[PDB]
């Protein structure tokens, strides 16, 4: 499904996806969906 408003996902150097919270200018390994 689509990420919540303000979020995106990218891949870290180690290849693991991380999620980016532009609403609070923070990131996390955990999927927010």
């Amino acid at each position: 499904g689509f990420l919540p408003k303000g979020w995106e996902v990218r891949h870290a150097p180690n290849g693991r996806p991380f999620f980016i919270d532009h609403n609070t200018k923070t990131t996390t390994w955990e999927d927010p969906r």
Binding site: R10, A12, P13, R16, F18, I20, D21, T27, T28, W29
Partner: peptide, 9 residues
């Protein structure tokens, strides 16, 4: 093994 911080985006 922490994620990249927001400054790295």
């Amino acid at each position: 093994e922490a994620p990249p911080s927001y400054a790295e985006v």
